[PDB]
Chains A and B, each alone.
Chain A
Amino acid sequence: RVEYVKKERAGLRLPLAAWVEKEAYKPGEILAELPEPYLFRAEEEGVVELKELEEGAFLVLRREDEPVATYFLPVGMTPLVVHGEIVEKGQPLAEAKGLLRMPRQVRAAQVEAEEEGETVYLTLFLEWTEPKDYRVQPHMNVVVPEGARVEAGDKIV
């Protein structure tokens, strides 16, 4: 199993009377607490590319094929869209109910925050590992040790 390192910029919008202000979020840390359920809505029109992690999700809007937005859904936020769905500006992507927290496998390095009306929009610099499994057959030998650091192109088996 190779856990691949991904470092990406993803956005989120929350009420203000519900988000806890921090400069970074460690895995598992509570991001916000909502008094009542809040509907996170699309800020762009596009087709949805949905990427679901172990816990938490990623949502990526693209028009034509150019990605116009990358949103981050923490734990406590249930996607209301399915992969490859057309959305219009303003329709709810995900419901956020109660306490929402960082997933266990994903972090938040730098956190930038803008304030608009009664909501905050987080530009999150997120780092996480996405697992992929490879099967090794009897005539194959693994040439790489447990915990090795590999770049693109390195031989594993």
Chain B
Amino acid sequence: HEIGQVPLLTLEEEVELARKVEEGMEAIKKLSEITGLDPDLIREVVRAKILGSARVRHIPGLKETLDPKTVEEIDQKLKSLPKEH
């Protein structure tokens, strides 16, 4: 019943989401270069804010314990970028 609550994608929507996922990964790669951070750490920080405050935990491999302090600190370094970055 719960899966049946998400409608199946149209060919356009399927391509759209897929497109956005690929572009986002490339964005995280670029955001790593600009910032001097770790692409995975950035990815988990990006992902943390999307899913919300609900899910926050240490991720095996990330260099920092991923607690609300670090996701705020790192998010503030990402939001300190110029408009084009």
Residues of B near any A CB (own CB < 8 A):
11-12, 15-16, 19
Contacts and interface: CB of A to CB of B under 8 A. Distances in A.
A112 B16 CA distance: 53
Interface of A: 138-139, 141
Contacts, number: 6
Contacts of B11: 138
Contacts of A139: 15
6 contacts: A138-B11, A138-B12, A138-B15, A139-B15, A141-B16, A141-B19
Nearest to B12: A138
A34 to B, nearest CB: 54
Contacts of A138: 11-12, 15
A138 B18 CA distance: 13
A139 B13 CA distance: 10
B11 to A, nearest CB: 5
A72 B68 CA distance: 69
Contacts of B15: 138-139
A143 to B, nearest CB: 11
A155 to B, nearest CB: 15
Nearest to A137: B12
B27 to A, nearest CB: 15
Nearest to B19: A141
Nearest to A139: B15
